[PDB]
C-alpha cells in the first residue's frame, strides 16, 4: 500500500518568462515522482497541490516521519493513482515555499531570500512551469492531470493552456473563478500579514510575521467545519460567565490551531499563492464556455455535499460550460461531512469513481 | 425629510437576569426616539440595529455632524418609517459599546471598564432588555419590530419571545442561524483581537487592541463587494512587478479601510456581540417550524440578490418554516448590487414594499 521513502527532486531551467512581464532566471521546480514511467512515456499523471499542500503528495522522507504525503491514501501500489500502473508526478507551485522558485529563493545580489522582491505569479505561470518539468521528464502527453481546490484550478488551466498535452482532467472541489467569499477570506489573511509588526515590507529575515501568518492560516482550520458541525460546536446558547471566567481571555495560542512552529510556511508565499488564486478567472456562463472550448481531454468533476468553501454550485458551472462546449465530462457530487478538504480523505466512493475513470476511457 | 437634532436617552433598570445565570445590575439601555407616541400607545415601531449600527438610526446629534443616523433614508417625515405617523424607537444592544450596558460600562469596584468581566449575552437577552425599555416607554404592544442582518435576528427573536407584544415583524437580509461561513468570519475577527499584543486578557484600558479590532472590522468592509464587483476589482490577472514595486508592501494602513480612529468601536464588545450572533439558533426545517409556531404577528421577509453574507436561501428557510407553521408571511427578494448592507441604502422598491406593508394590514 505505501510507496515508501521518497526524495524531493529539483528540476532547474534557464528562465521562465511570466505573464506579467517579469522573468524567473533560473526557474527551480521541486517535485516528487511515484511509480515507473513507461518506455512509451504515456502512463504519467500530474498531481497539482492545494493551498496547504506541496510536492510531497505520497510516502515518507525518513523512517521517523509522523505522517505520509498529503494524498497518500490515493497514491501508491493498488491505490487510486496506482503506482503499479502509473508514473505519478507532483510539484510545488512557483511562488510556493517548499522547494520551487519563490520568495524564499536566495537573491543573487543580497544572498538573502527574495521576499517581496519575488514577482507576482499567476496560475497560468504555475502551469507553464509544470509544462517545463513534464517535458524535461520526457513526457509529451500526460495520461491525467488531477487536483482538488487550488489544485483543480491548475488542472483546469492545463486542459485549456496545453489542451493536446493531456488525455484526462480531474477537477475536484474547485472553481473556474473565486467567489467574493473566497477572496475575502484570503484578503483578511493577507491583511493580517501586512499589519503584522514583523512584516517589514516583506523583507523580513531574522524575525518573520509569525502572528500574521498564523492568523492567515487559521482561516483554513476554522473553515474546515461543515454547517452542521459548526452549529454543533456553537449550539443555541453562548457560554456561561464572562471572557475571563471561561478562560476565553487566554485564547491567544489558539491562532496556531494545534499546529506547531516547525511545520513551516512563509508569509510572502501565502500572499503570492493566494493572489494567483484570487486573480484567476475563466469566468462563468458564455464566457466560461468560450474559454473551455479549447479543451480536448476528458473531464471528471467531483464536488462535495458539505463543502461550502468550493461548493457544488461552482463545480456545476464548470460542468454546464463543458456541456455547452460539447466536451467529454462526468460529474459526481459526493456526500461529505467536512468544510472543504474532503477530497483529501480516504473514501470508498471517491476511490471507486477515480479508479473507474482512469480504467475506462469512455 | 430630516428628523433633525436628536438626543441619545438612557433608560436604567434595577437588574436583568441573563439566560446564562449572570446578572446585570443595573441595566442601562441607550436609545433614541423619532416621532410622537399616540395616547393609545399603539403606533410604536422598534428598530433593531446590525453589527456596525447603534441607537442613532436617524437624524443628527449636532449641526457639525457629517453623516445622519444609520437608517436615516428610512426614518423621518414622509419616509418609510414615517415619524409623521409613527413613534420610532432604536436602542443599542446590551453587550454593545455605544451607551447600553456593555464591556465599557464602569465597574463598581475598580472604576475601570468591565472589559472581559462583562457577562456573555445572547440575542434572547438583548431582546429581554428591549422589552424592559419598551414597557418603560408605556408600550404594551408594538406596531412593528424591524431590522436587517443582526437586527433581523433580534426582530425574529421578538416575534417568538414576546409573540403577543408586536403586530408586525420585518426581517431583512437575515437568518434563523449563522452558517459556518458567517461564524468563520467572526471567529477570525475574534482571534485577531485575542492575538493582539494589547489584548491583556480583555482588561486593556490605556492601550486597546486597535490593530486586532481593525482586522476584525475590515472583514465587514472587504465582504461588502458582490461577486461581480469583487471579480471586477480582481480581473483575470495578478499585478505587474512584485510586492515591493506595486507598493503592495506598504499596505499596513489598509486595515482601517479608510475609516478613522475617532469613529470608535471596542474589541470586547465585538467579541460579545458576535458571540451572541454565532450562538443564536432557531434551527432549520422541522425544528425552525416548531420554534416559529409561537409567533402570532404578520411577517415581512426581505432578501437581496447580491447579498452573499446573508443570502436569499437563509430568508427562504424562514419563509418556508413560517408557511409550514401557518403564519402570515410575505417574501420579497430585491435586486441589489452589494455584498451585504443593501438594506441600508435608499431604494425606491424597498421604500415601496415597506410603506405598503405598514399601511395595509392584510
Curated annotation (Swiss-Prot), chains A, B:
The keyword Transferase applies. It holds the Pfam family Abhydrolase_1. One of its GO terms (cellular component) is cytoplasm. The keyword Acyltransferase applies. Substrate binds at residues 217, 341. Its EC number is 2.3.1.31. It is found in: Cytoplasm. InterPro entries: AB_hydrolase_1, AB_hydrolase_fold, HAT_MetX-like. Keywords: Acyltransferase, Amino-acid biosynthesis, Cytoplasm, Methionine biosynthesis, Transferase. It catalyses: L-homoserine + acetyl-CoA = O-acetyl-L-homoserine + CoA. The active site is at 149 (nucleophile), 307, 340. Residues 43-345 form the AB hydrolase-1 domain. It is an enzyme of class 2 (transferase). One of its GO terms (biological process) is methionine biosynthetic process. GO terms for molecular function: homoserine O-acetyltransferase activity. Pathway: Amino-acid biosynthesis; L-methionine biosynthesis via de novo pathway; O-acetyl-L-homoserine from L-homoserine: step 1/1. Transfers an acetyl group from acetyl-CoA to L-homoserine, forming acetyl-L-homoserine. Utilizes a ping-pong kinetic mechanism in which the acetyl group of acetyl-CoA is initially transferred to the enzyme to form an acetyl-enzyme intermediate before subsequent transfer to homoserine to form the final product, O-acetylhomoserine. NCBIfam families: homoserO_Ac_trn, PRK00175.1. Belongs to the AB hydrolase superfamily. MetX family. Homodimer. This is Homoserine O-acetyltransferase.
